[PDB]
C-alpha cells in the first residue's frame, strides 16, 4: 500500500555495476530505490492490473540452536537473521522462551556455512556452533506431608511462620483446599497466604528448573505468634517446604516424543533401519 | 526570495561584481514585494545616482522597475 | 477543551450560569452541589485564594471558550498596549468572534457559535473565517453568509436573542455592527481583575 | 574528474616555460650589469623591465623599485 520511489535500473555482475535507463517487457533487471522490497511484489505506475505469480515456497525442516557470546553480538544476530529472512523467503529464525537462544533453520550444513561467512565478514558476528535444547515437563513421585518453617526478624518485630500441609500429586484434579480447622485454631486470613506460597511454585522445578505441575494441598496444621503476626511468612515457609519436598522424593522429567513420517522409494531404507 | 516560505520577497540589494547575497552591502536601495507587480516600493532615488556616478553596473533584472521609475531620463547625461 | 464533553459537572463545581439559568434546567432536581461523591455537608480540607484563582480562570476560560496557549498569547497581545490593562484584557476577550456573534443574538451559546463558524456559516466584508479569533473594532459590519440562511434553528435562536446596548443587531436579516467597546457593568463581572493579574506569574 | 582544469593545467606550463626563459634572460642581463657598470646595459635592462612590468609576469612596483636602486647606484659619478 506504498508509493515507492525508484532511483535507477541496473545489471548486477560480480565485477561492478551496469545501468541502463530502459528495458522492454519480458526481461530481467535490478532496481535501486524502492525503499522496501520482498519477493513476488507487484508494482504499478501505468495504472494497470496488479498480479501475483507464486506456486511454491519451501518450509524449513531442521531446527538448530546457537548461543551468543556478546549482548551486542546477540542483537546483531537478531538483526542479521531478520535481514537474511527478508533477502530470501525459505527459512525462519526464532528467539523463543522455550530455549532463550537463536533458533535457526535451513537446508544442509553448507548453507549455514555461507550464513556464518556472511555474518562474520559483514555483520561482525562471531557465531559459535552448539547443540539445540528443548523444554521438558517435570513431574514427581507421590510424597507425604511436608512442613514449612521460618524465623527471621525483619526490620523490627520478628517474622515467624509454621505450616504443616500435605501434597497429593494426581493428574485428575488441580489445586484443592479443605478447611480442616474445627476449633478455630487458625485465623481465616491465614487461609490465603499458604495457598499463595504454593502458586509461586506451580510452574517451576527446584531440581531442573522445569515446571512442577499437578500440585494439590490442604491446610492441616500451623503456628503463628500470640503477640506478633506475619503474613508472607506463610508464603516463604511454603516455598522452603516445596524445596524440601523436591529434595527428598526424586522428581522425574517428561520429554516430548515426536511423530516422524519418513519417506523413501525403498532404496535408502537401509539408512532407516541402521539409524532408527 | 526570502521571508516567509511560499511568500516571495526581494529586497533591491547592492553588489558591484562579487558580493554574494545576504551579506555586506554598500547601500540598501529599498524593498520589493514581488507578488503583485506594480513597482510599489520606497527608494532613495539618489542611491541609484550613486551607482551611476562611479560604475558598479546594476543587476540586469531589477532594470524594469527602474524603467518604470525612469532612471534613463536622469542617466542619459552620463556621457555628455 | 473546545468540546469538553461535559459542562454541568464543571458548572455545578463552580456555580456560574450563562445569564441566570442555563447550566440548570430542573434536570435531576436542580441543586447547588458538587458532582463528586464526598457528600455535600463539606467541600474540601485545604482552603486558599489560589482555589478562587482557579475558579475564576476556569469560569472566564470556558464561558467564552478559549484554550490556554491562546490565553497567554492574548494576554501578551493586550500587554502590548498600556494603561489599566485588566479592563483592556476583558474588553478584548469580549471582542472574540464567537463572543460577539453570541452577543448579536446570533447563537444559542458560544459552543454553538464556534460550531457554526467552524463549518463555514459566517462571512463579513469579504472575510471568511474558520477560527474564533476575530477582534471586533468600531466599523465592523457582520453578515451571516446567507447561503445557509435556510436554517430554521438560527432564526429560532435569534427570536429570543439577547440584545446589547453597545452594538447594533437586526433580528431577521442576520446582520449587525460593532458600534462600541464592551462596558463593565453591562456584563457579568464575576471575574475579579486583581485575581487575574495575580495569576500572571510567567515573567 | 575535470576537463578544463587539465586544459588549464597544460595551458600555463608552456606559458611558464617561456616566462621563466625571459625571466632568466633578464637575470643574465642584470648579472652582466653586476659584473661592470655602463649606461648602455642599464638602458637595455630598463627597456626589458618596461616589457616585463607591462606584462603580468613582473610587478610594476618591483620593476620601479629596482630601476630606482640602479639609477641611485649609478649616479655616484
Amino acid at each position: 500500500n506504498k508509493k515507492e520511489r525508484v532511483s535507477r535500473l541496473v545489471k548486477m555482475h560480480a565485477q561492478n555495476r551496469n545501468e541502463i535507463e530502459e528495458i522492454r517487457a519480458g526481461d530481467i533487471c535490478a532496481i535501486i530505490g524502492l525503499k522496501d522490497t520482498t519477493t513476488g511484489e507487484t508494482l504499478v505506475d501505468d495504472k494497470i492490473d496488479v498480479q501475483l505469480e507464486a506456486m511454491q515456497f519451501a518450509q524449513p525442516v531442521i531446527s538448530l540452536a546457537v548461543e551468543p557470546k556478546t549482548k551486542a553480538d546477540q542483537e546483531k544476530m537478531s538483526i542479521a537473521l531478520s535481514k537474511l529472512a527478508e533477502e530470501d523467503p525459505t527459512f525462519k529464525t526464532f528467539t523463543d522462551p522455550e530455549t532463550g537462544q537463536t533458533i535457526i533453520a535451513g537446508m544442509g550444513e553448507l548453507h549455514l556455512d555461507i550464513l556464518v561467512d556472511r555474518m562474520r565478514r559483514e555483520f561482525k558476528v562471531e557465531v559459535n556452533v552448539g547443540a539445540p535444547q528443548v523444554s521438558f515437563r517435570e513431574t514427581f513421585n507421590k510424597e507425604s506431608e511436608v512442613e514449612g518453617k521460618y524465623i527471621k526478624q525483619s526490620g523490627g518485630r520478628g517474622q515467624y511462620g509454621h505450616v504443616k500441609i500435605r501434597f497429593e500429586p494426581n493428574k485428575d484434579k488441580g489445586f484443592e483446599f479443605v478447611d480442616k480447622i474445627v476449633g478455630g485454631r487458625i485465623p481465616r486470613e491465614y487461609i490465603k497466604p499458604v495457598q499463595a506460597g504454593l502458586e509461586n511454585a506451580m510452574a517451576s522445578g527446584p531440581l531442573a528448573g522445569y515446571p512442577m505441575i499437578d500440585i494439590k494441598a490442604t491446610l492441616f496444621d500451623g503456628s503463628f505468634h500470640e503477640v506478633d503476626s506475619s503474613e508472607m511468612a506463610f508464603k516463604i515457609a511454603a516455598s522452603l517446604a516445596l524445596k524440601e519436598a523436591g529434595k527428598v522424593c526424586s522428581p522425574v522429567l517428561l520429554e516430548p516424543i515426536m511423530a516422524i513420517e519418513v519417506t523413501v522409494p525403498e532404496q535408502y531404507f537401509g539408512d532407516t533401519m541402521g539409524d532408527i | 526570495r526570502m521571508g516567509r516560505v511560499h511568500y516571495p520577497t526581494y529586497r533591491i540589494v547592492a553588489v558591484d561584481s562579487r558580493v554574494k547575497r545576504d551579506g555586506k552591502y554598500i547601500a540598501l536601495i529599498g524593498h520589493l514585494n514581488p507578488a503583485l507587480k506594480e513597482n510599489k516600493c520606497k527608494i532613495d532615488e539618489a542611491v541609484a545616482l550613486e551607482w551611476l556616478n562611479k560604475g558598479a553596473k546594476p543587476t540586469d533584472t531589477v532594470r524594469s522597475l527602474f524603467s518604470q521609475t525612469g532612471l534613463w531620463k536622469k542617466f542619459v547625461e552620463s556621457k555628455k | 477543551m473546545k468540546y469538553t464533553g461535559s459542562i454541568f459537572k464543571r458548572s455545578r463545581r463552580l456555580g456560574f450560569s450563562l445569564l441566570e439559568n442555563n447550566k440548570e434546567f430542573s434536570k435531576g432536581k436542580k441543586r447547588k452541589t458538587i458532582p463528586g461523591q464526598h457528600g455535600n455537608r463539606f467541600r474540601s480540607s485545604t482552603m486558599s485564594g489560589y482555589a478562587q484563582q482557579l475558579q475564576e480562570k476556569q469560569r472566564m476560560q470556558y464561558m467564552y471558550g478559549i484554550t490556554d496557549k491562546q490565553f497567554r498569547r492574548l494576554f501578551r497581545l493586550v500587554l502590548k498596549q498600556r494603561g489599566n490593562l485588566a479592563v483592556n484584557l476583558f474588553r478584548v476577550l469580549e471582542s472574540r468572534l464567537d463572543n460577539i456573534v453570541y452577543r448579536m443574538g446570533f447563537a444559542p451559546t458560544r459552543r454553538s457559535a464556534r460550531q457554526l463558524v467552524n463549518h463555514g456559516h459566517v462571512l463579513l466584508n469579504d472575510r471568511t473565517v474558520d477560527t474564533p479569533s476575530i477582534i471586533l473594532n468600531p466599523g465592523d459590519k457582520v453578515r451571516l453568509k446567507a447561503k445557509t440562511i435556510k436554517i430554521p434553528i438560527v432564526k429560532a435562536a435569534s427570536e429570543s436573542g439577547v440584545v446589547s446596548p453597545f452594538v447594533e443587531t437586526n433580528n431577521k436579516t442576520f446582520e449587525g455592527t460593532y458600534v462600541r467597546f464592551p462596558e463593565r457593568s453591562e456584563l457579568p463581572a464575576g471575574i475579579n481583575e486583581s485575581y487575574v493579574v495575580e495569576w500572571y506569574k510567567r515573567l | 574528474n575535470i576537463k578544463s582544469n587539465e586544459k588549464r593545467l597544460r595551458q600555463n606550463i608552456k606559458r611558464n616555460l617561456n616566462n621563466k626563459g625571459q625571466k632568466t634572460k633578464l637575470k643574465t642581463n642584470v648579472k652582466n650589469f653586476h659584473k661592470e657598470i655602463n649606461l648602455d646595459n642599464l638602458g637595455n635592462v630598463y627597456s626589458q623591465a618596461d616589457r616585463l612590468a607591462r606584462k603580468g609576469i613582473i610587478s610594476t612596483n618591483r620593476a620601479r623599485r629596482l630601476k630606482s636602486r640602479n639609477v641611485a647606484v649609478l649616479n655616484k659619478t
Binding site: 549482548k71 542483537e75 532463550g100 | - | - | -
Partner: protein, 67 residues
C-alpha cells in the same frame, strides 16, 4: 560504555533482567542507599515493560488498557 559502574534500584514488579541483559540508565533519586543515583526506564528496551499500572502510565511499560 565508560569504565565507571553505578548501582540502581529496580522499579516495577518482577524483573526482565537475565544475566547481562542490556539496560538503559536514566537520572534518578533514591535516598535509601549511597550509590543509587539512577533508574532503569521501562517501555523501550529488551524490557517491554509491565502491566498492573494505570494511575501511572508513562514512566513504565504501562499501555492504555485494551478496552
Amino acid at each position: 560504555t565508560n569504565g565507571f559502574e553505578v548501582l540502581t534500584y529496580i522499579p516495577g514488579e518482577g524483573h526482565n533482567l537475565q544475566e547481562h541483559s542490556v539496560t538503559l540508565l536514566r537520572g534518578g533519586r533514591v535516598k535509601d542507599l549511597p550509590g543509587v543515583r539512577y533508574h532503569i526506564v521501562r517501555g523501550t528496551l529488551d524490557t517491554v515493560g509491565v502491566e498492573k499500572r494505570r494511575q501511572q502510565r508513562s514512566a513504565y511499560g504501562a499501555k492504555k488498557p485494551k478496552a
